[model samples]
Target: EVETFAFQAEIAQLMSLIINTFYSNKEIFLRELISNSSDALDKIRYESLTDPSKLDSGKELHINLIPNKQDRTLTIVDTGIGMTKADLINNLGTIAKSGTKAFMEALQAGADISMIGQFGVGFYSAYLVAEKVTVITKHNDDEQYAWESSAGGSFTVRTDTGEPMGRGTKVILHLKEDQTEYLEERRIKEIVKKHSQFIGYPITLFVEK
Candidate 1:
């Protein structure tokens, strides 16, 4: 069975800041997310090259954006290294991975600003644009799991509802009222190209009319 956990108070506060403050531009949400997906693909690609028997053998690296206007949702899917239940908990439910502590120490010691990116808290940035976020992922070595969160200091993980996506991750963004601009194809595409054009994978946008 997949294990689950909840967010600590500090972690929750960080999530709020990431959504409203850190990313002053809403359009950058696509860039941040695509960057994450690219990282995952890079991980899998490197591993596969060394181990021919690795899972996700026939999969190609790609990113997909699915927008649902009526429901006010946007989903970004990738055929990259997916997370397991434990990964979901640690990644979303706590202050475990964020380099905030290191960041603070660095600032106190007068460290460089470039170190902020090493914080490893990139995943939580999704909450900035999504009211509710759902992650469906299949790990190369574990059972597929579904994680859902609302940035309310709580989250749930269960068996995924959809068919297994082979070996990859899918993030569904439930955009807030003011975030509606993300639903436009041109807007989403422009952001993707600007921030993620050099991402090393084909990025596709899917529209359901």
Candidate 2:
């Protein structure tokens, strides 16, 4: 099943700010994304401690960055706790209900702006550099699904029929006109090490020969 919905007013305003005002620092998109992945990995790991089956036992936890220069795409894959269909709607669909307010409040409070994902709009930061974003995720309890948006105040979610990801999420960014710099291995490595090196899980960049 595929469905599409327009963003709430709050979400539209937040995306506008991210795309127009906060994009001066575009590289933070990767940092925010990796942090989200790390958090997912952490959540599953913690749950496994109690149930041992929350995640597939013995599955290696890591994040992979695959850059396709020819297509100007950057794919970030994480073997972490993925989201169910409802999770996708709650997390990505309703942005401003609570998160947008907190995000704006934090900015007014002069909080460290680097860690914005805590505010919920962190994922929208991808719009800073990507013209479009696609998320493919599979949770242990639900079928695989794909969520996509071009930041045009609307998004679509559909049951994915492609190859299963086992249990994880893959975020694919279609780089914007001047954002191809993110497709370079060297540039991505520099940003990852500078902002995300301390993340608990291993982060690997897939480079082409």
Candidate 3:
């Protein structure tokens, strides 16, 4: 079954603030996405310590970034603990649950606010450059599903039948006209190294020579 939901009022307001305010530092979108991916990978790794069966015992844990200039899309894939359908709604549809209010409070108080992952709203930062964002994910306990949004205060979640990703999530960003720089291979490598070099998981950029 598929469903559509509007962002909580507070969250919609916060999204408006983020989109309208972060024009100059839009590049941080990449950093936040990678950081979120690293965190997800870390979570699964930690969980496996106790269960040992949480993730495939020997699966290579890493992040793959695929940039398709022709399609004007950048896809970030991670082998992490994927979200279930309910997880998607709670984590992405609602603001209070994702900690956006705290982020707004800190921002108003003039806190550093550089680490967006701290507030859990880092996922929405993709709207800074992408006209549309799609997340296709699979969890061990749930069927593969895709969540999509254009930062328009509402989003849809549906079962994904295109291909089964055994586990983990794939985020595809459809670049806006003015955000084409994000599709360049050289630029992507530089940004990854600059902001995400210290990330625990291996990060690979897929490009055609």
Candidate 4:
């Protein structure tokens, strides 16, 4: 049910660099992901301003963090402007042609990784903690699709046939063996309060029972 695409050789090197070093505080992964959803929500809101039909799917705007201890996975969900199939492939696949060189230099320059907006490699930060990441999304203009990937490898996109979801995006991060702390709501709350407390959207954290 999935088709795979090879990651660019440059992107593979960039990912390995990210997974191996540069990020000292791994908790920032939550901030990057939450910011991603916030941007998506902002887009849909702006789209609806021009054409009301964009809101036809739903208007409930919010982000939720769901952690499953047993599964060692963390899911960040949002009712935002979801990506189309091409958008999913291109947005996540192509790390700008010159991105690797620039970022590698930045990493070596002792640059403060936190203040620089991840050098446009926000989503890739998931690999700092997760062994795999799965994204199931539904755009207002298109049907549902799933995009999945792990570190230093290709990602897959496929038609999603799971429980029907509203217009939104769901990103599930499968934690690595040593990243177990991310699956705890207590620690997540700490990170949220520290890095994401001022986000305009309400972020709720709930542990799956």
Overall local distance difference test of candidate 4: 0.84
The alpha-carbon lDDT assigned to residue 95 of candidate 3 equals 68
Each prediction's total of clashing residue pairs, residues at least 3 apart in sequence or on different chains, is 1, 0, 0, 0
| Candidate 2: residue 4 lDDT (0-100) | 96
lDDT of each: 0.75, 0.84, 0.83, 0.84
Q: Per-prediction TM-score, please? A: 0.84, 0.90, 0.91, 0.92
Taking the tens digit of each residue's C-alpha lDDT, what string does model 4 give over 59-150? 78899999998888999999999988888887777764235557767767876555335566677778888889999999977889998888
Clashing pairs in 2: none
> RMSD, each candidate, Å?
3.4, 2.3, 2.0, 2.0
Per-residue lDDT tens digits of candidate 1, residues 1-209? 44456677767766665556544555656777787888888878888888866653446888889999999999899888878777767776776757766665664586543334467665666666788888888877888788888876677888876786888888889887878888999888888877778877998999677
Q: Where does model 4 exceed 4 Å of error?
A: 96-101, 115-118
Question: Which ten contiguous residues of candidate 3 have the minimum total lDDT?
Answer: 110-119
* Candidate 2 lDDT: 0.84
TM-score attained by model 4: 0.92
